[model samples]
Target chain A: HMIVEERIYRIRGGKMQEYLKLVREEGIAIQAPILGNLIGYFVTDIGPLSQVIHMWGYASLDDRAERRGKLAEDQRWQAFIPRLSVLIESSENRILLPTDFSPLR
Target chain B: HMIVEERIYRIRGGKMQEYLKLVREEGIAIQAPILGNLIGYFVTDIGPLSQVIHMWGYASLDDRAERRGKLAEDQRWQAFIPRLSVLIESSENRILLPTDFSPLR
Candidate 1:
């Protein structure tokens, strides 16, 4: 059973495009190792605010802890964090596992 | 210069998953020819409602008319339309093109 973690980050004001550009250019630098665990990322249109959402897959809580610890210590990712803080307003994260009957599969 | 058209559909009740299932199962049956002109589709989590959004690319208004006319006449699509009406409450569509400095590129 794969555990899926989804997060939504609401950007401050109108800084979405600016942030998206940074993601595209430096995605390898900021997210390469992370991508091994990622399923997808999406930008959502919600009236006035732009929402950035992404999904990650993991084997278990302990597996998440191990990979996440490594991610936190990656120097390139540490450097990328400050830039994200400037554009994000608030964020939410959820962990989900597919139900046996889930139609998504 | 690619012309991009974006559309948002608000699903009625909790039918977003059902609608998405239909789209996924019959993508070739419903969206194949259309996919030639489509960029992407996303389902967004917005508070209590799920929003379905999609992007399309076209060369011009006339080009849209030509492709859309072909799409409308496709019998498989006409059959698929009624099922959609029951699930979607309202929809909005907009057309945009990249600005000289559009960051999407």
Candidate 2:
């Protein structure tokens, strides 16, 4: 079964624009290829301001581990994380199993 | 820009299976046509247990309000909510704006 990993990051106060700009200009370009299967990337609009939410799909847990391992080893991603990390206050991660009737499944 | 409304429900412990069964067999049938654009429906696999996370896409927030109001007026959906609500401990709602590079956007 396919799985989606949901990651929610809380951007530091007064830093969301910087975070978005960084991702828009440089961050995502570096990670998208290495990360693969980006389901969605979003910023909160009506609830939980300053939150960044992203989802990635994988064939299975093993698939996620392998892809994520590659991401970790990428030099470009390594260079990108520090620039992004300082703007993030915290993050939460969850792995999800799509329901039978889910369009994404 | 398109928006996604993500709803996260915490299911009562030990009642997740029943909750999923109800949604699979009856609840979605009532809501899907009215709700429209069912992006995804998922149950937590890692991190918080018994969480039902679902996302729905809309052209804009106004579109969401229009569709949701219609859903609220639907008798079948009205009836279905109570059955599912009992199994939900709590819920959180967030409206998201997709990042420029997001696949969904």
Q: What's the lDDT for residue A94 in model 2? A: 94
For model 2, the interface Cα RMSD in angstroms equals 0.6
- Candidate 1 C-alpha error for residue B93, in Å: 6.4
For residues B3-85, what per-residue lDDT tens digits would candidate 2 score against the true structure? 89999999999999999899999988878787788999999989998899999989978888998999999898888888899
Q: Which ten residues in a row have the lowest lDDT in candidate 2 chain B?
A: B28-37
**Which whole-number lDDT from 0 to 100 does residue B24 have in model 1?**
68
**Which model scores highest in lDDT?**
2
**Model 1 alpha-carbon drift over 4 Å, by segment:** A1-10, A13-27, A37-69, A91-105, B1-28, B37-66, B73-75, B90-105
lDDT of 2 at B12: 94
Q: Candidate 1 - CAPRI tier?
A: incorrect
Candidate 2 Cα misplacement greater than 4 A, ranges: none
For residue B70, what is the lDDT in candidate 1?
Answer: 79
Model 2 lDDT tens row, A24-52: 89888877777678999999988989999
